[PDB]
Symmetry: D2
Subunit: 122 residues, 4 copies
């Protein structure tokens, strides 16, 4: 799945996820969000299961973006957790957690949850 | 917070999180889970906000572990999203998503959610 | 939105959600899951915002099903949290948490997270 | 567990959860949040597993509050999903999803996630 995961992906929001999957389970690349307090590309790093089940199961993976780059700092980090499904309609189906830096008093409202589906076309 | 984050952390489950925070926002290290289909150390990578608010707010961060190493492959990945709070009782407060590789039919039950609190003592 | 919410809804899994919205914010009805350790109808109850923003915003709502009925007991409960969006393509977009009863030792793996989209056709 | 669940509970935020558990699996009561856009009591309804495992497992349950009452309308709903654990240090351990009513453009940031632990003392 190293071959299947590596490349450019697009989600339902119009965001662009560019990733290289290493032979070892490494994920590295950049993320550009179509929404939120974000501009241009942000570094991402993550991990994937580099020897997944050969019984038609998806390939577990995850990655993180910290929303600081040379343009902006949104004092937040998003992690996507999900699975890569290969084939003619390849998809990475994820759920994500976005945590903002907050005061201790506001910690209860620090974390957003959502889901993104990434495809090779878009 | 590069200085504050780098080091060994322990969660409420007895798991051990060893991390180095780079000047740039990189997180690298190893994770050893006290629970689940896990044995020994697993590679982790993530990101943190390397220029956080100076108004007492936490420092947003996240990381991923893919549960494959030389001992075991649990066909899953966990991402922790949260914030580092410094001081005498330093803490990393997180929520996490664990996605297992599944068939498409079982995708609805692919993802666990929980929360971990990490401290320097434990 | 009392009028818009009340009725039969179907999700992407083929599950059937039958609900009555009270003038007061009450939700009552039955849920039939197409998947999992479930058979036939289960009681549901919840709440909705009965005076939502008139600026095109969705209507916040939530409900719970405990997976015990006369046929089966799956020792679990699911809560859906989301919003109702009216119009020709009316939708209830949700994220859900399914907690199973567990021993204290297994509590870390007690809770599934996912998302369901409900429509009037299906 | 009907007997164990019924009563007044307090979370780590100082919020007050007053509930009656019906013989049938019904949960009814009021919630008063110590934090957020909330004042006084709000109606809650939910469900619990009224015949849980007798192997030391927790009792699955969930409930919803819509954040509208005679004082305020926060255009949001929270659902708590978790388990009741009985005994001398009885606890209801939950994870929750708070969805706000939003425009379709802002739906990606509509939902907060967190966790609450409720005890009989506090
Ligand atoms: Ir395998
Ligand atoms: Ir969605
Ligand atoms: Ir700042
Ligand atoms: Ir917990
Ligand atoms: Ir309003
Ligand atoms: Ir999905
Ligand atoms: Ir049982
Ligand atoms: Ir917390």
């Amino acid at each position: 799945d190293e071959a299947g995961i590596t490349g450019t992906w697009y989600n339902q929001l119009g965001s662009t996820f560019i990733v290289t999957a290493g032979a070892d389970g490494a994920l590295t690349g950049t993320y550009e969000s179509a929404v939120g307090n974000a501009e241009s590309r942000y570094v991402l790093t993550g991990r994937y299961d580099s020897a997944p089940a050969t019984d038609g199961s998806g390939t577990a993976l995850g990655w993180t973006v910290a929303w600081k780059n040379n343009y902006r700092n949104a004092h937040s980090a998003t992690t996507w957790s999900g699975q890569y499904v290969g084939g003619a309609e390849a998809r990475i189906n994820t759920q994500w957690l976005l945590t903002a830096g907050t005061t201790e008093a506001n910690a209860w409202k620090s974390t957003l949850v959502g889901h993104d589906t990434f495809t090779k076309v878009k």
